[PDB]
């Protein structure tokens, strides 16, 4: 809710930052294995824990 702790807000901050797509210059490295970010987490589908 609007009412948050410091621990929860740091926690939700890390999950926002982690939920960006991969850069396009990583798909051209010599060990080209990662195609796309398989750890994308949408608010409505998967509920983050807590």
């Amino acid at each position: 809710s609007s009412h948050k702790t410091f621990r929860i807000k740091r926690f939700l901050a890390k999950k926002q930052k982690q939920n960006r797509p991969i850069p396009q210059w990583i798909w051209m490295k010599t060990g080209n294995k990662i195609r796309y970010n398989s750890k994308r987490r949408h608010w409505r589908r998967t509920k983050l824990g807590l």
Binding site: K9, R10, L12, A13, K14, Q16, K17
Partner: protein
């Protein structure tokens, strides 16, 4: 703290501060609105520190 910010900007920019107001962003980083006492203009200082 606001006290440490108000000492820092004064020491780092040769300035004077009316008040400091802080909020912690959803990035997990603080953003501090440092209002200056009327002896100094924000736009006069913005140029010399190098933001425009």
């Amino acid at each position: 703290n606001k006290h440490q910010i108000k000492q820092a900007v004064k020491k780092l920019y040769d300035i004077d501060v009316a008040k400091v107001n802080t909020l912690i962003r959803p990035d997990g980083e603080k953003k501090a609105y440092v209002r200056l006492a009327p002896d100094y203009d924000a736009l006069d200082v913005a140029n010399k520190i190098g933001i425009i």
